[PDB]
Design a protein around this ligand. Structure first.
Ligand SMILES: Nc1ncnc2c1ncn2[C@@H]1O[C@H](COP(=O)(O)OP(=O)(O)O)[C@@H](O)[C@H]1O
Ligand SMILES: Nc1ncnc2c1ncn2[C@@H]1O[C@H](COP(=O)(O)OP(=O)(O)O)[C@@H](O)[C@H]1O
Ligand SMILES: [Mg+2]
Ligand SMILES: [Mg+2]
Lengths: 328, 365
């Protein structure tokens, strides 16, 4: 139960002008850059809604996303995840070399302990035998006994966040996408967003990054989140940010509005007609559900119950960073 | 006890006109059973000096140690260096590597890395280190902590160690075909190692005779002068300089900050020694070289000394040239060599505004 001062602090935090910048630029302030990648984790921390339609039979559908990050080494894709795991009501961090099939699953596995939380897994690529052991837990949203499958099920609600390295160390720029990841068409479709990061030798970016790392030790939705030097964006302490997700996850249930659904319908019908002829990951009906699940997510961060056209216009730009915008 | 501090202060105060003579005498006592090996005997001291840890407020903290790796043809002296460095440091655990199971390299019971907190874990025979075991250490080499959830226990342990390893070059070594090909190590692994010094044996008719005379005449310490140093004195020295906390300066950082920007893209930028984990080491070495000379203010001299070692570390492709580590000897006068190195470096990477000031400082000293 939350104290009175807790409610006062939550109400005060809700009153900020730009509530999205103060959350997307305070999850981890050491890392410089990577705005959309941090926005993805910020969206995934909250989650979506659970649909119990047709209560006679239901067959419920999961209401939380799954994010995978793949890119060149040295970019820093192992500290955006530590902060994400730390800022959570319940989290767990496990490596991908010291854990086996009996470890991730019940034998109480890592997934069970990460109930209603995040179970971020590092070094995803190094796994070669446990790949076919979580396709059931991720989709069915339940896990049964591992002893000959004699019933005895137990709930397992997880929001797996994974990071991995390409097969050939550095990822070269003249191949096909499918052979640089070593993944089938079954495990590459469950995940909601699959960001691909490159490391190129620019000039201004390096000059800013070196200055930032030397100082430490002594409009599209890509510029409105960036900080122009000459202002203060003082971050919320993680102690106070951990007691905001909890209030947001049990006192508001968002739902879509009639205006927002049209944009998603148009985007789905535009993706399908174009990528059914070109070569890419097949667009099943899962993406239409994914857009709904993420547009509901951008209504639990600002503590509202609706989906305006502006909110549905943000899961269109962040979506074009692993799909069409990046497949080229 | 004031006696030890008084003795060290006297020793480092006598050598005031010549500052590098003290460092040369310091280095001469490291592994005194071998002849030569200037850069190799300097890199070990720089690595063993250590670094400074900087932790951020909320959750994160960056590394503050260093690592080293040696490759060379059999019959060069890697084992002597490892065995000698396993004794000076207070706490050390020496393992065989391929002769050690997974229970040591990771947690099981405490293994080897967990058992060497605030120490130095020597590792030998790194060529075929049980590939699973050789990838189960990527997390413990860079974050200084272990993170496992085996058997549904959720246990976290701390491991702050400096890894010193040496592996043979499987397959006949070639001047070309950079170590990523000859040794066949993955790019993610071959990026956390600060220095990769290549030892190569070649055609010479003088080093052969000198080594033969050294071994045959049983002449230990050809410098018959009684300066040397006992092992207790060096243990005290490398357990006492680990308390000073140096701070950066302004005549300092800019040199590294320009060197990294120029090295980021010359024409090749190698393939794996160009990432951002280079400026995180070019500082941890410059701060270590300032704790070996009894001061706490990094100046132009420390940066100019740490630039050359890193320049020679990158074998083959570089910006100045590659010099073999084996065929090197102690210079007769280090001051003139330093004065030449400063003038050479500070020209192509343009900060001539500091050359005049440094020369003026060197004049009235
Ligand atoms: N933008 C950045 N600012 C400061 N440090 C960075 C940045 N990007 C990467 N780093 C450095 O990179 C290191 C993280 O390595 P990382 O890329 O996570 O390894 P891996 O590629 O194996 O996941 C950190 O020590 C951090 O200091
Ligand atoms: N400069 C030197 N002076 C005296 N002995 C040397 C010198 N260099 C090498 N040695 C001899 O070579 C041996 C070192 O073997 P080493 O090459 O370390 O084995 P490995 O190839 O397994 O690492 C020592 O026993 C030492 O006697
Ligand atoms: Mg990582
Ligand atoms: Mg040996």
């Amino acid at each position: 139960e939350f104290s009175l001062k807790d409610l006062y602090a939550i109400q005060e935090i809700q009153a900020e002008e730009n509530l999205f910048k103060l959350i997307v630029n305070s999850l981890c302030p050491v890392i410089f850059g990577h705005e959309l990648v941090k926005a993805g984790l910020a969206l995934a921390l909250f989650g979506g809604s659970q649909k119990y339609a047709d209560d006679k039979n239901r067959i419920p559908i999961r209401g939380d996303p799954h994010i995978l990050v793949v890119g060149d080494p040295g970019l820093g894709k192992s500290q955006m995840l530590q902060a994400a795991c730390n800022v959570a009501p319940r989290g767990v961090y496990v490596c991908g070399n010291t854990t086996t099939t009996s470890g991730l699953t019940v034998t109480a596995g890592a997934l069970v302990l990460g109930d209603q939380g995040i179970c971020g897994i590092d070094q995803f690529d190094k796994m070669g035998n446990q790949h076919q052991a979580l396709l059931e837990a991720m989709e069915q949203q339940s896990i049964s006994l591992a002893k000959a499958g004699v019933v005895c099920s137990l709930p397992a609600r997880t929001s797996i966040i994974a990071a991995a390295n390409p097969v050939g160390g550095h990822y070269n720029k003249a191949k096909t996408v499918s052979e640089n990841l070593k993944m089938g068409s079954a495990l590459l479709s469950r995940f909601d967003l699959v960001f691909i990061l490159l490391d190129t030798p620019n000039e201004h970016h390096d000059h800013l990054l070196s200055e930032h790392v030397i100082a430490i030790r002594a409009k599209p939705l890509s510029e409105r989140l960036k900080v122009v030097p000459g202002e203060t964006i003082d971050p919320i302490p993680h102690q106070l940010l951990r007691k905001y997700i909890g209030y947001a996850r049990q006192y508001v249930y968002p739902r879509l509005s009639t205006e927002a659904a049209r944009v998603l319908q148009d985007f789905y019908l535009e993706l399908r007609k174009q990528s059914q002829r070109l070569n890419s990951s097949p667009i099943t009906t899962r993406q239409l559900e994914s857009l709904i699940r993420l547009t509901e997510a951008r209504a639990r961060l600002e503590l509202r119950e609706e989906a305006t056209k502006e909110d549905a216009e943000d899961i269109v730009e962040i979506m074009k960073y692993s799909m069409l915008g990046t497949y080229s | 006890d004031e006696e030890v501090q008084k003795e060290f202060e006297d020793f480092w105060e006598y050598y005031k006109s010549d500052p590098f003579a003290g460092r040369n005498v310091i280095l001469a006592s490291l592994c005194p059973q071998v002849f030569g090996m200037y850069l190799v005997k300097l890199a070990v001291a720089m690595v063993l000096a250590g670094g400074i840890q900087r932790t951020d407020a909320t959750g994160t903290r960056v590394r503050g140690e260093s690592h080293l790796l040696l490759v060379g043809d059999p019959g060069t002296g890697k084992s002597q260096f490892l065995k000698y460095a396993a004794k000076i440091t207070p706490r050390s655990v020496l393992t065989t590597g391929i002769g050690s199971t997974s229970a040591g390299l990771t947690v099981t019971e405490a293994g080897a890395l967990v058992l060497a907190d605030a120490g130095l874990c020597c590792i030998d025979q790194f060529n075929s280190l049980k590939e699973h075991d050789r990838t189960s250490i990527h997390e413990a080499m860079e974050q200084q902590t272990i993170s496992v959830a085996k058997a549904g226990l959720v246990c976290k342990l701390n491991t702050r160690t400096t890894i010193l390893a040496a592996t043979n070059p499987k397959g006949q070594y070639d001047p070309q075909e950079s170590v990523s090909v000859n040794i066949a190590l993955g790019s993610p692994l071959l990026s956390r190692f600060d220095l990769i010094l290549v030892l190569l044996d070649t055609k010479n008719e003088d080093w052969d005779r000198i080594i033969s005379s050294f071994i045959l005449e049983n002449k230990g310490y050809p410098s018959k002068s009684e300066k040397l140093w006992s092992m207790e004195k060096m243990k005290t020295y490398f357990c006492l300089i680990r308390n000073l906390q140096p701070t950066l300066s302004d005549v300092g950082n800019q040199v590294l900050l320009r060197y990294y920007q120029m090295q980021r893209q010359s024409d090749c930028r190698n393939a794996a020694r160009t990432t951002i984990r280079l400026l995180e080491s070019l500082i941890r070495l410059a701060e270590a070289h300032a704790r070996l000379m009894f001061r706490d203010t990094v100046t132009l001299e420390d940066a100019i000394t740490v630039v050359s070692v890193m320049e020679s570390s990158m074998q083959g492709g570089a910006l100045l040239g590659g010099v073999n580590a084996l065929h090197t000897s102690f210079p007769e006068n280090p001051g003139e060599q330093y004065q030449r190195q400063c003038e050479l470096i500070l020209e192509k990477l343009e900060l001539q505004s500091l050359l005049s000031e440094e020369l003026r400082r060197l004049e009235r000293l």
